[PDB]
């Protein structure tokens, strides 16, 4: 069970665009994806924890 490739794409695009999803924009992306908000928030948080372990070479000192 997985979010779609598109949804994941749009999420990473949103993560690139912005780091912290406020009420309205989270709804907007959640509509654009079609997920239940909670999921987007979770994805956004977890995305941080699997941002900084992928963003290596540059991101060694943190």
Curated annotation (Swiss-Prot):
Belongs to the Antp homeobox family. It comes from Drosophila melanogaster (Fruit fly). It is found in: Nucleus. The lineage of its organism: Eukaryota, Metazoa, Ecdysozoa, Arthropoda, Hexapoda. Sequence-specific transcription factor which is part of a developmental regulatory system that regulates segmental identity in the mesothorax. Provides cells with specific positional identities on the anterior-posterior axis. Residues 2-55 bind DNA. Coiled coil: none annotated. The chain holds residues 303 to 363 of 378 of the full protein. This is Homeotic protein antennapedia. Loss of Antp results in altered development of the embryonic thoracic segments. Overexpression can cause antennae to be transformed into legs.
């Amino acid at each position: 069970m997985t979010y779609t490739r598109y949804q994941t794409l749009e999420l990473e695009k949103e993560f690139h665009f912005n780091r912290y999803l406020t009420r309205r924009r989270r709804i907007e992306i959640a509509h654009a994806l079609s997920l239940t908000e909670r999921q987007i928030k979770i994805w956004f948080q977890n995305r941080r924890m699997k941002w900084k372990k992928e963003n290596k070479t540059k991101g060694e000192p943190g």
